Amino acid sequence: KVWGSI
Amino acid sequence: KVWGSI
Amino acid sequence: KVWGSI
Amino acid sequence: KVWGSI
Amino acid sequence: KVWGSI
Amino acid sequence: KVWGSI
Amino acid sequence: KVWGSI
Amino acid sequence: KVWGSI
Question: Which of B2, C5, D6, G5 has the fewest beta carbons under 10 Å from its own?
Fold first, then answer.
């Protein structure tokens, strides 16, 4: 699982 | 920007 | 910026 | 598990 | 589950 | 901004 | 679980 | 800002 918010 | 892979 | 990998 | 917020 | 609000 | 992952 | 608020 | 991880 990988996620990002920028 | 948001994204995810699972 | 926030991100995580698990 | 790794994560970061900056 | 992942969530966010901006 | 608020975020979370579970 | 990880959470944050900015 | 507040953050946590459990």
Answer: D6
Technique that determined the structure? X-ray
Resolution, given in Å to one decimal, reads: 1.4
Write down which chains contact chain B via at least 3 CB pairs under 8 A. A
Tokens standing for residue H2:
């507040």
- Measure in Å the smallest separation between the Cα of D6 and chain G Cα atoms: 10
In angstroms, the Cα distances linking D5 to D1, E2, E4, H4 are 14, 15, 13, 11
Residues of F in contact with C2 (CB under 8 A): 3
